[PDB]
Amino acid sequence: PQQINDIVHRTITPLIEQQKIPGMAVAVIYQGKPYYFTWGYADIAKKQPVTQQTLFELGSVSKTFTGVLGGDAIARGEIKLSDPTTKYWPELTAKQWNGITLLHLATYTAGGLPLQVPDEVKSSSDLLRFYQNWQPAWAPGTQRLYANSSIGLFGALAVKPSGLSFEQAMQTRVFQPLKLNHTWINVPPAEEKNYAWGYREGKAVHVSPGALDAEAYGVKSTIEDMARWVQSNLKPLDINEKTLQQGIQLAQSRYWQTGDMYQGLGWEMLDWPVNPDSIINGSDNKIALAARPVKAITPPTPAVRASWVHKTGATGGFGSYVAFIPEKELGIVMLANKNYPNPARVDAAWQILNALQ
Numbered sequence: 001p002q003q004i005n006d007i008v009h010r011t012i013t014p015l016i017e018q019q020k021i022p023g024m025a026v027a028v029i030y031q032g033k034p035y036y037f038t039w040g041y042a043d044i045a046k047k048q049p050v051t052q053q054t055l056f057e058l059g060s061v062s063k064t065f066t067g068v069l070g071g072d073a074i075a076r077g078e079i080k081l082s083d084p085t086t087k088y089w090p091e092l093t094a095k096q097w098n099g100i101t102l103l104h105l106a107t108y109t110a111g112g113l114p115l116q117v118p119d120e121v122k123s124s125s126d127l128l129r130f131y132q133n134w135q136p137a138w139a140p141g142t143q144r145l146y147a148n149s150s151i152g153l154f155g156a157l158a159v160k161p162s163g164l165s166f167e168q169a170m171q172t173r174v175f176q177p178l179k180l181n182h183t184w185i186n187v188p189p190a191e192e193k194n195y196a197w198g199y200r201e202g203k204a205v206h207v208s209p210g211a212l213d214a215e216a217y218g219v220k221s222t223i224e225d226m227a228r229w230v231q232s233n234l235k236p237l238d239i240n241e242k243t244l245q246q247g248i249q250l251a252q253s254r255y256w257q258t259g260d261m262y263q264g265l266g267w268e269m270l271d272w273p274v275n276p277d278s279i280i281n282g283s284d285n286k287i288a289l290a291a292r293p294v295k296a297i298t299p300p301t302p303a304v305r306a307s308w309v310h311k312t313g314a315t316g317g318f319g320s321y322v323a324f325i326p327e328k329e330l331g332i333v334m335l336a337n338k339n340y341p342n343p344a345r346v347d348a349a350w351q352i353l354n355a356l357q
């Protein structure tokens, strides 16, 4: 519909110009159907255009897959958010871990686990040593500090009862049921032709390996698969696998509140209608990566349909954004191979979705 076309082109054209974005793909999900848009270059040097089959690094949008996979493990009865972390990692004997649950890890509330795992932390024994030596700044369940080392550990522990690797669990329990057949934690050689380069300060870059990278920022996907991901989270009851349907719902439950935002598993939520300044200004890393006190939602509120549900994501060379409103059957995916500022992403998305609702 030309409505959607005009709204998308009027918003995204100046965005690409202002932010000097080499390549971009957008999907609008409207009344149960996807509409796709593409611009510019997946590979500047080889003049490869962005297409609907181009793979982008999702970066920290990957945490929404980790949260849903954890939700599925809960639904299967393999894990409980109320479980002690030591239940699944008994070698974690240092006393500061008493009272830190899987809920705390999944929601960044364990007491100040760091944003990044240190570069020097490679092996399973390096990781154990790192968490054993870590000293919390706050008591558990009092402060939120967005952190790869928190939900990354949640994801690694959540798959342990299944006996599967994190990648294998993700493939079998999330990607394959939802027909995300071009979504990868490790891009296979046969798919490299579609893997866009990211651009950082003009240099072509791909994400480098890191501990817990798959769990915190490691998924790559196409605009078509990401539209399917949005539709799956918009309407979980259409999903025929029972524990996956349940796990999607659990990831949109409201566990903590800070300001006007609610923390789910990976996803973040606000009541719809939102104040746009709240979500735009709130997506700035100055707010999004800051330590903030949280109020427990006791017990957590089940997924609220009248919500703005969203997640920003980045790697060194890529910037992504996903947002949807279940009440309105409406969503958007924006995938770019430049890590450009979060408020510009959310501003564009709110202009498009507000116009269409």
Ligand SMILES: O=C(O)[C@@H](CNC(=O)[C@@H]1C[C@@H]2CC[C@H]1C21CC1)Oc1ccccc1
Pocket: 059, 060, 115, 148, 207, 208, 210, 217, 285, 289, 313, 314, 315, 316, 317, 339
């Ligand atoms: O290793 C990487 O290339 C990735 C992996 N992405 C993350 O870790 C996330 C992205 C940034 C950093 C923490 C999370 C974030 C606040 C949104 O991102 C980087 C690293 C260096 C510079 C910019 C991005």
